[PDB]
Amino acid sequence: HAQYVGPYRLEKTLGKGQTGLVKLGIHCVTCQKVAIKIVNREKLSESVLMKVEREIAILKLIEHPHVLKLHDVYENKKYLYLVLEHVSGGELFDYLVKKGRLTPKEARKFFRQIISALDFCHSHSICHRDLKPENLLLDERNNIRIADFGMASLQVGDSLLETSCGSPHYACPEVIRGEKYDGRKADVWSCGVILFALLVGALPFDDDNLRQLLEKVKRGVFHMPHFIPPDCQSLLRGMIEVDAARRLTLEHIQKHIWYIGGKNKVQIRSLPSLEDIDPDVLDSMHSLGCFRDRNKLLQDLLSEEENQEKMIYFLLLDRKLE
Amino acid sequence: KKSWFGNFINLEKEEQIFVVIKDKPLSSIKADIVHAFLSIPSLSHSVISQTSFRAEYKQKPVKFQVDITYTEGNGIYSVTFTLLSGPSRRFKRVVETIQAQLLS
Protein backbone atom coordinates (compact mmCIF):
# COMPACT_ATOMS: atom_id res chain seq x y z
CA HIS A 1 0.00 0.00 0.00
CA ALA A 2 1.36 3.32 -1.26
CA GLN A 3 3.48 5.65 0.90
CA TYR A 4 3.43 9.42 0.34
CA VAL A 5 5.58 12.42 1.15
CA GLY A 6 3.08 15.22 0.78
CA PRO A 7 2.03 15.03 -2.87
CA TYR A 8 4.84 12.66 -3.87
CA ARG A 9 4.15 8.98 -4.24
CA LEU A 10 7.20 6.90 -3.21
CA GLU A 11 8.41 4.40 -5.78
CA LYS A 12 11.72 2.67 -6.38
CA THR A 13 14.98 3.22 -4.57
CA LEU A 14 17.55 5.16 -6.59
CA GLY A 15 20.31 5.14 -3.96
CA LYS A 16 20.88 3.12 -0.77
CA GLY A 17 23.26 2.73 2.19
CA GLN A 18 26.16 5.19 2.43
CA THR A 19 25.31 8.68 1.13
CA GLY A 20 21.83 7.74 2.34
CA LEU A 21 18.59 6.23 1.11
CA VAL A 22 17.05 7.89 -1.94
CA LYS A 23 13.64 7.23 -3.44
CA LEU A 24 11.89 8.21 -6.63
CA GLY A 25 8.89 10.39 -5.90
CA ILE A 26 6.03 10.97 -8.32
CA HIS A 27 3.77 14.00 -7.90
CA CYS A 28 0.23 12.60 -7.71
CA VAL A 29 -1.27 15.42 -9.81
CA THR A 30 1.52 16.59 -12.12
CA CYS A 31 3.31 13.22 -12.55
CA GLN A 32 6.60 15.07 -12.17
CA LYS A 33 9.64 13.18 -10.87
CA VAL A 34 11.68 14.08 -7.80
CA ALA A 35 14.43 12.37 -5.79
CA ILE A 36 13.62 11.96 -2.13
CA LYS A 37 16.53 11.53 0.26
CA ILE A 38 15.41 9.89 3.48
CA VAL A 39 17.38 10.79 6.59
CA ASN A 40 16.94 9.45 10.13
CA ARG A 41 16.73 12.41 12.50
CA GLU A 42 16.56 10.60 15.86
CA LYS A 43 20.18 11.39 16.72
CA LEU A 44 20.31 14.92 15.26
CA SER A 45 20.06 17.66 17.90
CA GLU A 46 17.75 20.64 17.50
CA SER A 47 20.49 23.19 16.96
CA VAL A 48 21.96 20.97 14.26
CA LEU A 49 18.56 20.83 12.58
CA MET A 50 18.01 24.58 12.90
CA LYS A 51 21.46 25.37 11.43
CA VAL A 52 20.75 23.10 8.47
CA GLU A 53 17.30 24.62 7.90
CA ARG A 54 18.82 28.09 7.77
CA GLU A 55 21.26 26.97 5.05
CA ILE A 56 18.59 25.07 3.14
CA ALA A 57 16.36 28.17 3.38
CA ILE A 58 19.03 30.06 1.41
CA LEU A 59 19.49 27.21 -1.12
CA LYS A 60 15.75 27.12 -1.70
CA LEU A 61 15.98 30.77 -2.76
CA ILE A 62 18.95 30.73 -5.12
CA GLU A 63 19.53 28.93 -8.41
CA HIS A 64 22.63 28.02 -10.34
CA PRO A 65 23.08 25.92 -13.51
CA HIS A 66 25.35 23.47 -11.64
CA VAL A 67 23.61 23.21 -8.27
CA LEU A 68 21.03 20.45 -7.78
CA LYS A 69 17.78 22.10 -6.81
CA LEU A 70 15.85 21.41 -3.58
CA HIS A 71 12.06 21.74 -3.62
CA ASP A 72 11.15 21.11 0.05
CA VAL A 73 11.82 19.26 3.26
CA TYR A 74 9.28 17.10 5.08
CA GLU A 75 9.60 16.06 8.71
CA ASN A 76 8.18 13.55 11.15
CA LYS A 77 9.48 12.16 14.44
CA LYS A 78 12.02 9.76 12.92
CA TYR A 79 12.76 11.07 9.42
CA LEU A 80 13.58 14.08 7.34
CA TYR A 81 12.52 13.75 3.68
CA LEU A 82 14.58 15.98 1.40
CA VAL A 83 12.72 16.51 -1.86
CA LEU A 84 15.21 17.19 -4.62
CA GLU A 85 15.38 17.65 -8.33
CA HIS A 86 15.68 14.38 -10.24
CA VAL A 87 18.48 14.03 -12.79
CA SER A 88 18.90 11.21 -15.27
CA GLY A 89 22.61 11.17 -16.13
CA GLY A 90 24.19 9.16 -13.31
CA GLU A 91 27.50 10.23 -11.76
CA LEU A 92 30.46 12.12 -13.22
CA PHE A 93 32.84 9.31 -12.15
CA ASP A 94 30.79 6.69 -14.01
CA TYR A 95 31.91 8.66 -17.06
CA LEU A 96 35.56 8.75 -15.92
CA VAL A 97 35.43 4.97 -15.50
CA LYS A 98 34.45 4.40 -19.13
CA LYS A 99 37.29 6.66 -20.28
CA GLY A 100 39.86 5.74 -17.64
CA ARG A 101 41.05 9.33 -17.70
CA LEU A 102 39.86 12.65 -19.11
CA THR A 103 41.37 14.91 -21.70
CA PRO A 104 42.78 18.09 -20.09
CA LYS A 105 40.21 20.11 -22.04
CA GLU A 106 37.37 17.89 -20.94
CA ALA A 107 38.64 17.98 -17.36
CA ARG A 108 38.80 21.79 -17.61
CA LYS A 109 35.14 21.89 -18.78
CA PHE A 110 33.73 19.99 -15.79
CA PHE A 111 36.21 21.76 -13.47
CA ARG A 112 34.88 25.19 -14.49
CA GLN A 113 31.31 23.99 -13.89
CA ILE A 114 32.25 22.96 -10.37
CA ILE A 115 34.28 26.07 -9.46
CA SER A 116 31.45 28.21 -10.75
CA ALA A 117 28.90 26.42 -8.52
CA LEU A 118 31.23 26.62 -5.50
CA ASP A 119 31.83 30.33 -6.10
CA PHE A 120 28.10 30.97 -6.36
CA CYS A 121 27.31 29.03 -3.15
CA HIS A 122 30.22 30.51 -1.20
CA SER A 123 29.22 34.04 -2.10
CA HIS A 124 25.83 33.19 -0.54
CA SER A 125 27.66 31.80 2.55
CA ILE A 126 27.02 28.16 1.67
CA CYS A 127 29.96 25.78 1.82
CA HIS A 128 29.75 22.14 0.82
CA ARG A 129 32.22 20.77 3.43
CA ASP A 130 32.04 17.22 2.08
CA LEU A 131 32.44 17.43 -1.68
CA LYS A 132 32.77 13.94 -3.22
CA PRO A 133 32.29 12.16 -6.57
CA GLU A 134 28.84 10.90 -5.42
CA ASN A 135 27.79 14.58 -5.20
CA LEU A 136 28.71 15.26 -8.79
CA LEU A 137 25.65 14.33 -10.82
CA LEU A 138 25.07 14.65 -14.57
CA ASP A 139 21.92 15.96 -16.21
CA GLU A 140 20.34 15.33 -19.61
CA ARG A 141 23.08 17.34 -21.39
CA ASN A 142 25.96 15.95 -19.32
CA ASN A 143 26.23 19.13 -17.27
CA ILE A 144 27.23 18.78 -13.64
CA ARG A 145 24.65 19.38 -10.91
CA ILE A 146 26.25 19.25 -7.46
CA ALA A 147 24.24 17.46 -4.76
CA ASP A 148 24.26 18.07 -0.99
CA PHE A 149 25.19 21.70 -0.47
CA GLY A 150 24.15 22.58 3.10
CA MET A 151 23.75 18.96 4.14
CA ALA A 152 27.11 17.95 5.65
CA SER A 153 25.60 18.06 9.16
CA LEU A 154 22.82 15.66 8.32
CA GLN A 155 25.43 12.90 8.36
CA VAL A 156 23.44 10.66 6.05
CA GLY A 157 24.84 7.28 7.01
CA ASP A 158 24.83 3.69 5.79
CA SER A 159 24.46 2.27 9.28
CA LEU A 160 22.34 3.28 12.25
CA LEU A 161 25.07 1.94 14.52
CA GLU A 162 27.97 3.65 12.74
CA THR A 163 28.19 7.46 12.59
CA SER A 164 28.92 8.80 9.09
CA CYS A 165 32.36 10.47 9.09
CA GLY A 166 32.67 11.97 5.60
CA SER A 167 34.92 10.62 2.86
CA PRO A 168 38.53 10.97 3.93
CA HIS A 169 39.96 10.58 0.40
CA TYR A 170 38.58 14.01 -0.52
CA ALA A 171 38.89 15.79 2.86
CA CYS A 172 41.43 18.48 3.72
CA PRO A 173 43.71 17.78 6.70
CA GLU A 174 42.01 20.36 8.88
CA VAL A 175 38.69 18.51 8.45
CA ILE A 176 40.47 15.19 9.13
CA ARG A 177 41.92 16.55 12.39
CA GLY A 178 38.54 17.80 13.66
CA GLU A 179 39.82 21.38 13.84
CA LYS A 180 37.92 24.57 13.24
CA TYR A 181 38.20 25.28 9.55
CA ASP A 182 37.14 27.53 6.72
CA GLY A 183 34.55 25.63 4.69
CA ARG A 184 35.60 27.57 1.59
CA LYS A 185 39.19 26.33 2.02
CA ALA A 186 37.98 22.75 2.55
CA ASP A 187 35.90 22.85 -0.66
CA VAL A 188 39.00 24.09 -2.55
CA TRP A 189 41.08 21.13 -1.33
CA SER A 190 38.31 18.65 -2.15
CA CYS A 191 38.02 20.29 -5.51
CA GLY A 192 41.76 19.80 -6.20
CA VAL A 193 41.50 16.09 -5.34
CA ILE A 194 38.56 15.66 -7.69
CA LEU A 195 40.41 17.48 -10.47
CA PHE A 196 43.45 15.23 -9.92
CA ALA A 197 41.10 12.24 -10.28
CA LEU A 198 39.62 13.60 -13.52
CA LEU A 199 43.04 13.99 -15.06
CA VAL A 200 44.74 10.89 -13.73
CA GLY A 201 42.00 8.28 -13.23
CA ALA A 202 43.37 7.58 -9.75
CA LEU A 203 43.47 9.31 -6.35
CA PRO A 204 46.39 11.38 -5.00
CA PHE A 205 45.97 9.73 -1.56
CA ASP A 206 44.97 6.13 -1.24
CA ASP A 207 45.83 3.20 1.04
CA ASP A 208 44.48 -0.17 2.19
CA ASN A 209 45.07 0.90 5.78
CA LEU A 210 42.83 3.68 7.05
CA ARG A 211 45.31 5.12 9.56
CA GLN A 212 47.95 5.25 6.81
CA LEU A 213 45.54 7.01 4.48
CA LEU A 214 44.94 9.69 7.14
CA GLU A 215 48.69 10.20 7.58
CA LYS A 216 49.12 10.63 3.81
CA VAL A 217 46.33 13.24 3.73
CA LYS A 218 47.85 15.31 6.59
CA ARG A 219 51.26 14.98 4.93
CA GLY A 220 50.02 16.28 1.58
CA VAL A 221 52.70 14.43 -0.37
CA PHE A 222 51.46 12.77 -3.58
CA HIS A 223 52.99 11.81 -6.95
CA MET A 224 52.22 14.25 -9.78
CA PRO A 225 52.09 12.24 -13.03
CA HIS A 226 54.48 13.74 -15.58
CA PHE A 227 52.03 13.90 -18.46
CA ILE A 228 50.04 16.57 -16.59
CA PRO A 229 51.06 19.94 -18.07
CA PRO A 230 53.22 22.11 -15.74
CA ASP A 231 50.71 25.00 -15.34
CA CYS A 232 47.97 22.56 -14.50
CA GLN A 233 50.31 20.88 -11.98
CA SER A 234 50.94 24.18 -10.17
CA LEU A 235 47.18 24.69 -9.92
CA LEU A 236 46.72 21.21 -8.40
CA ARG A 237 49.53 21.95 -5.93
CA GLY A 238 47.99 25.30 -5.00
CA MET A 239 44.68 23.59 -4.24
CA ILE A 240 45.98 20.44 -2.59
CA GLU A 241 48.02 22.53 -0.17
CA VAL A 242 48.24 21.49 3.48
CA ASP A 243 48.74 25.00 4.86
CA ALA A 244 45.20 26.38 4.75
CA ALA A 245 46.69 29.90 4.81
CA ARG A 246 48.63 29.35 1.59
CA ARG A 247 45.93 27.26 -0.12
CA LEU A 248 44.51 28.98 -3.22
CA THR A 249 41.25 30.91 -3.00
CA LEU A 250 38.57 30.60 -5.66
CA GLU A 251 39.43 34.04 -7.05
CA HIS A 252 43.05 32.97 -7.61
CA ILE A 253 41.87 29.68 -9.14
CA GLN A 254 39.72 31.51 -11.68
CA LYS A 255 42.68 33.80 -12.57
CA HIS A 256 45.05 30.84 -13.04
CA ILE A 257 46.29 30.51 -16.63
CA TRP A 258 45.22 26.88 -16.83
CA TYR A 259 41.71 27.75 -15.64
CA ILE A 260 41.48 30.47 -18.30
CA GLY A 261 42.82 28.31 -21.13
CA GLY A 262 44.60 29.80 -24.13
CA LYS A 263 42.07 29.51 -26.96
CA ASN A 264 41.27 33.25 -26.83
CA LYS A 265 23.15 38.45 -6.93
CA VAL A 266 21.55 39.58 -3.67
CA GLN A 267 22.90 42.85 -2.31
CA ILE A 268 23.11 42.92 1.48
CA ARG A 269 22.45 46.37 2.86
CA SER A 270 22.01 47.07 6.56
CA LEU A 271 18.76 47.64 8.44
CA PRO A 272 18.99 50.79 10.59
CA SER A 273 15.54 50.57 12.23
CA LEU A 274 12.85 47.98 12.85
CA GLU A 275 10.47 50.30 11.01
CA ASP A 276 12.42 49.51 7.82
CA ILE A 277 11.95 45.76 8.23
CA ASP A 278 9.33 44.22 5.93
CA PRO A 279 6.51 42.57 7.93
CA ASP A 280 5.56 40.18 5.14
CA VAL A 281 9.17 39.04 4.81
CA LEU A 282 9.36 38.76 8.59
CA ASP A 283 6.33 36.45 8.60
CA SER A 284 7.80 34.21 5.91
CA MET A 285 10.92 33.93 8.00
CA HIS A 286 9.05 33.37 11.26
CA SER A 287 7.24 30.39 9.71
CA LEU A 288 10.54 28.43 9.93
CA GLY A 289 11.35 26.40 13.04
CA CYS A 290 14.86 27.84 13.08
CA PHE A 291 13.30 31.27 13.72
CA ARG A 292 10.80 30.59 16.53
CA ASP A 293 12.50 33.40 18.46
CA ARG A 294 11.02 36.52 16.80
CA ASN A 295 13.13 38.93 18.85
CA LYS A 296 16.38 37.06 18.25
CA LEU A 297 15.67 37.31 14.50
CA LEU A 298 15.20 41.08 14.78
CA GLN A 299 18.43 41.38 16.73
CA ASP A 300 20.12 39.37 13.99
CA LEU A 301 18.81 41.68 11.26
CA LEU A 302 19.53 44.90 13.16
CA SER A 303 23.10 43.95 14.09
CA GLU A 304 26.14 45.07 12.08
CA GLU A 305 27.56 41.60 11.36
CA GLU A 306 26.74 39.81 8.11
CA ASN A 307 24.84 36.60 8.87
CA GLN A 308 22.51 34.09 7.21
CA GLU A 309 19.47 35.84 8.71
CA LYS A 310 20.26 38.89 6.56
CA MET A 311 20.96 36.69 3.54
CA ILE A 312 17.52 35.12 3.78
CA TYR A 313 15.83 38.48 4.44
CA PHE A 314 17.29 40.18 1.38
CA LEU A 315 16.80 37.14 -0.82
CA LEU A 316 13.15 37.23 0.21
CA LEU A 317 12.91 41.01 -0.08
CA ASP A 318 14.23 40.95 -3.65
CA ARG A 319 11.99 38.00 -4.47
CA LYS A 320 9.22 40.39 -3.37
CA LEU A 321 10.27 43.24 -5.67
CA GLU A 322 9.25 41.28 -8.78
CA LYS B 1 4.77 14.77 7.79
CA LYS B 2 5.13 18.55 7.95
CA SER B 3 6.64 20.74 5.23
CA TRP B 4 9.40 23.13 6.30
CA PHE B 5 8.84 25.58 3.47
CA GLY B 6 5.11 25.48 2.86
CA ASN B 7 4.59 28.91 4.42
CA PHE B 8 7.92 30.36 3.41
CA ILE B 9 7.93 31.10 -0.31
CA ASN B 10 6.18 30.07 -3.51
CA LEU B 11 8.56 29.50 -6.45
CA GLU B 12 5.82 28.11 -8.69
CA LYS B 13 3.70 30.18 -11.11
CA GLU B 14 0.62 29.07 -9.19
CA GLU B 15 0.25 28.94 -5.41
CA GLN B 16 -1.16 25.51 -4.59
CA ILE B 17 -1.79 23.14 -1.74
CA PHE B 18 -2.24 19.42 -2.31
CA VAL B 19 -3.92 16.88 -0.07
CA VAL B 20 -3.85 13.13 -0.68
CA ILE B 21 -6.95 11.27 0.50
CA LYS B 22 -6.56 7.56 1.26
CA ASP B 23 -9.82 5.80 2.11
CA LYS B 24 -12.79 7.83 0.82
CA PRO B 25 -14.85 7.59 -2.37
CA LEU B 26 -15.45 10.72 -4.47
CA SER B 27 -18.83 11.28 -2.81
CA SER B 28 -17.34 11.46 0.69
CA ILE B 29 -14.60 13.79 -0.48
CA LYS B 30 -17.07 16.23 -2.05
CA ALA B 31 -19.26 16.06 1.06
CA ASP B 32 -16.27 16.90 3.26
CA ILE B 33 -15.44 19.94 1.13
CA VAL B 34 -18.97 21.29 1.07
CA HIS B 35 -19.34 20.82 4.84
CA ALA B 36 -16.12 22.78 5.32
CA PHE B 37 -17.40 25.52 2.98
CA LEU B 38 -20.71 25.89 4.81
CA SER B 39 -18.88 25.81 8.14
CA ILE B 40 -17.22 29.02 7.02
CA PRO B 41 -19.86 31.77 7.21
CA SER B 42 -17.80 34.43 5.40
CA LEU B 43 -17.23 31.98 2.56
CA SER B 44 -19.56 31.40 -0.35
CA HIS B 45 -18.87 28.76 -2.99
CA SER B 46 -20.33 27.39 -6.20
CA VAL B 47 -20.01 24.17 -8.22
CA ILE B 48 -18.12 24.53 -11.51
CA SER B 49 -17.62 20.88 -12.43
CA GLN B 50 -18.34 17.35 -11.27
CA THR B 51 -14.86 17.52 -9.70
CA SER B 52 -14.26 21.21 -8.95
CA PHE B 53 -15.49 24.18 -6.95
CA ARG B 54 -14.91 27.90 -6.71
CA ALA B 55 -14.99 29.70 -3.39
CA GLU B 56 -14.57 33.24 -2.09
CA TYR B 57 -13.66 34.26 1.47
CA LYS B 58 -14.42 37.88 2.42
CA GLN B 59 -9.24 44.33 2.46
CA LYS B 60 -9.27 41.93 -0.52
CA PRO B 61 -11.34 38.74 -0.82
CA VAL B 62 -9.56 35.44 -1.25
CA LYS B 63 -10.76 33.70 -4.38
CA PHE B 64 -9.71 30.09 -5.07
CA GLN B 65 -10.51 26.83 -6.79
CA VAL B 66 -10.74 23.27 -5.41
CA ASP B 67 -10.09 20.31 -7.75
CA ILE B 68 -10.41 16.58 -7.08
CA THR B 69 -8.41 14.25 -9.33
CA TYR B 70 -8.02 10.45 -9.36
CA THR B 71 -4.50 9.11 -9.00
CA GLU B 72 -3.60 5.66 -10.31
CA GLY B 73 -3.03 2.73 -7.97
CA ASN B 74 -7.98 0.44 -4.89
CA GLY B 75 -8.60 4.18 -5.23
CA ILE B 76 -6.61 7.17 -3.94
CA TYR B 77 -7.59 10.80 -4.61
CA SER B 78 -5.95 14.18 -4.42
CA VAL B 79 -7.49 17.58 -3.76
CA THR B 80 -5.81 20.63 -5.28
CA PHE B 81 -6.34 24.09 -3.85
CA THR B 82 -5.45 26.90 -6.22
CA LEU B 83 -5.28 30.57 -5.21
CA LEU B 84 -6.84 32.77 -7.90
CA SER B 85 -6.54 36.15 -6.17
CA GLY B 86 -6.29 37.55 -2.66
CA PRO B 87 -3.70 37.39 0.17
CA SER B 88 -1.77 34.11 0.56
CA ARG B 89 -1.95 34.15 4.33
CA ARG B 90 -5.75 34.08 4.46
CA PHE B 91 -5.78 31.46 1.70
CA LYS B 92 -3.48 29.15 3.67
CA ARG B 93 -5.68 29.49 6.75
CA VAL B 94 -8.93 28.69 4.96
CA VAL B 95 -7.28 25.71 3.23
CA GLU B 96 -6.03 24.43 6.61
CA THR B 97 -9.59 24.17 7.95
CA ILE B 98 -10.90 22.50 4.80
CA GLN B 99 -7.94 20.14 4.81
CA ALA B 100 -8.61 19.29 8.44
CA GLN B 101 -12.14 18.26 7.53
CA LEU B 102 -10.82 16.20 4.60
CA LEU B 103 -8.35 14.37 6.83
CA SER B 104 -10.95 13.59 9.48
Numbering used by the authors:
A (entry chain B): 13 to 276, 287 to 344
B (entry chain A): 519 to 576, 585 to 599, 606 to 636
The publication says:
To unravel the regulatory mechanism of AIS, all the AIS-containing fragments in complex with KD-UBA were subjected to crystallization trials, and the complex structure containing the AIS-KA1 fragment of residues 519–653 was determined to 2.5 Å resolution. The UBA similarly binds to the kinase domain from backside, and the AIS-KA1 fragment sits on the top of KD-UBA. Comparison of two KD-UBA conformations, in isolation and in complex with AIS-KA1, revealed that the AIS-KA1 binding does not induce a large rearrangement of the kinase domain, and that the major inactivating effect is likely due to the influence of AIS on the αC conformation. Consistent with the trans-inhibition results, the non-inhibitory KA1 domain makes few contacts with KD-UBA. Contrarily, the AIS sequence, adopting an extended conformation, makes many interactions with both the kinase and UBA domains. Two consecutive aromatic residues from the AIS, Trp522 and Phe523, penetrate into a hydrophobic crevice between the β-sheet and αC helix of kinase domain. The following Phe526 and Ile527 stick into an adjacent hydrophobic pocket formed by residues from three helices, the kinase αC and the UBA α1, α3. The conformation of AIS is further stabilized by multiple hydrogen bonds, directly or water mediated; in particular, Trp522 and Ser521 from the AIS interact with two acidic residues Glu87 and Asp84 on the kinase β4 strand. The extensive interactions ensure the stable complex between KD-UBA and AIS-KA1 and reinforce the inactive conformation of the essential αC helix. More importantly, the AIS sequence pries away the N-lobe β-sheet from the αC helix, resulting in further separation of the pivotal Lys49 and Glu67.
